[PDB]
Amino acid sequence: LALSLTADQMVSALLDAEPPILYSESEASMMGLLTNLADRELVHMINWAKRVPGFVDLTLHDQVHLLECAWLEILMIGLVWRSMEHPVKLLFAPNLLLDRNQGKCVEGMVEIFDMLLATSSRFRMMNLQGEEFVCLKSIILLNSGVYTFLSSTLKSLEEKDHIHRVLDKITDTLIHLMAKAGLTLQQQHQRLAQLLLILSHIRHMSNKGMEHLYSMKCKNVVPLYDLLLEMLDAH
């Protein structure tokens, strides 16, 4: 039961469940590169989700729902995290470091690349730590689709309450980390807020990215990658 984990047991576990590092393998060519990478990452995201404290306590239907609702936001936060140390660049994969102008290969892509670069620059100046990063990524998984759960079932309501309590623990964990980092109580509250407010920006970029992917899909410029198509369809 995730509710028993201590702050350190929570973080250490999240850090150990991190997905493995993957390498990537015109407008269509660009879209192919990104969608191919996302499809492959999704397989590992599913394995990772299973290890997020509390995720497997949910019904299979609810696990599916959370992943359908947060997948792109999770790929994106991982991307801004990797891109931290590379000012002005987006590190999609160790062998795929793209500059802002690279986004011009695709109509409407520079816009989202700019938002991604902005968030990365933001995490950099804030000096986001990996312990914090993994907590944020888990929060996204749990928070995104919880309010879209059915409200017409006692079991669904209990599922929502369970997720909310696990989310509370992750909150204590984040506070704990900032505490030992030497932050005052005021700095802790402020930093926790800044981080959670960024999650709001990520949800926005994800929504914009999704609309972009669907529009390209419609232009038939998206390869038939079955899992990616499944996740896209869920939106």
């Binding site: 397989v43 599913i46 394995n47 299979l60 599916v64 359908e68 899992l227 499944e230 369809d233």
Partner: peptide, 9 residues
């Protein structure tokens, strides 16, 4: 959804 369902199981 079938692939997601399979991988999760």
């Amino acid at each position: 959804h079938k692939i997601l369902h399979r991988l999760l199981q």
